[PDB]
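Subject: Predicted fold for Complement C1s subcomponent, 378 residues

User T.R. writes:
Posting the sequence so we have a shared reference for the thread.
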Amino acid sequence: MPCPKEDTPNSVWEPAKAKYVFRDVVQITCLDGFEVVEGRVGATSFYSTCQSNGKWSNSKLKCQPVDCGIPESIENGKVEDPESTLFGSVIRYTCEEPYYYMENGGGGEYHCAGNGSWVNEVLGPELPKCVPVCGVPREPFIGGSDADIKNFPWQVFFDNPWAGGALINEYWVLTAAHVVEGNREPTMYVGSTSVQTSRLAKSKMLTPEHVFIHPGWKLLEVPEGRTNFDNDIALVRLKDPVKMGPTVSPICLPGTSSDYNLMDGDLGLISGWGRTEKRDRAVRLKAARLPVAPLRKCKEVEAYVFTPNMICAGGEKGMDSCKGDSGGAFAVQDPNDKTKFYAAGLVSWGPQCGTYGLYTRVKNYVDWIMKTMQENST
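User M.O. replies:
I've generated the structure tokens; pasting them so everyone works from the same file.
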């Protein structure tokens, strides 16, 4: 005749009574995190009625923990294999270190919340973004020596003709305008210490979506006898993002602040496969270390123009800027972080090279760089 109230963890009954009787109707609500799964629904409340036989109409319907389900994956990241996916469970996202780090990480710890979704203390249900770590080479680096591609993972090799550039994120290569005014659809390659024309299908090719030449770059009908190198800078947007790894990763950009100004004597690394192309053998990457020198030098050899948008480097006899690929990066150690490199300069001055080098002063172009990258996103 009367209906007993059985064990009620996981739920609350309105009205809550000690002893229920025939015809009594009870509303049952599951506690947050709990549901009754029947058919296509996870019911969080329902009615049950006390029958003439003392059994409840919906006895045996039980509130169970919600399942947040198998965690979504992220690009350039992994999620540790979870012990359960039920209410209150904890998962941990991490990025592929050291080539990637978590962008404003909530720490990557998510928990299975009451409504069935994985949530993070700060991000709510948004997943972590894993973005490329810039500037830090796996293995760091007279007239110049032998290099490995690991010393300069940001080096982009251009091919027709031989030239260079620097990878600055997963979608963008930084290079000299002189290098691209000719080929608007440049062939680019990354990830190898050696280059061999017959052998290029083995080294990972980048495909250009579009080339952005700095508007201050004076265009010439006759490019071979260019006297003015002001604003020698350009951006190439790639179709596909670049996977980072021990042989490929971007280089940092300079800040706008004055500690990214250069003093005479400041050391920079240049790198490349050389000015003279070789079609019959393999050529290994080479590098050289050069001191910043005052611009008032860089005048021996009618007649070149010089602006504060240019950096001069070198000076002693055996120094060689040819080493030294066009459009490549003049790499200086970061002032706030001795462990990462940034592109202070891009290799300028066309064919002119040796003993002293000329470099586009990257710092004066940071605004234009960020603007282009943000206004040509996706």
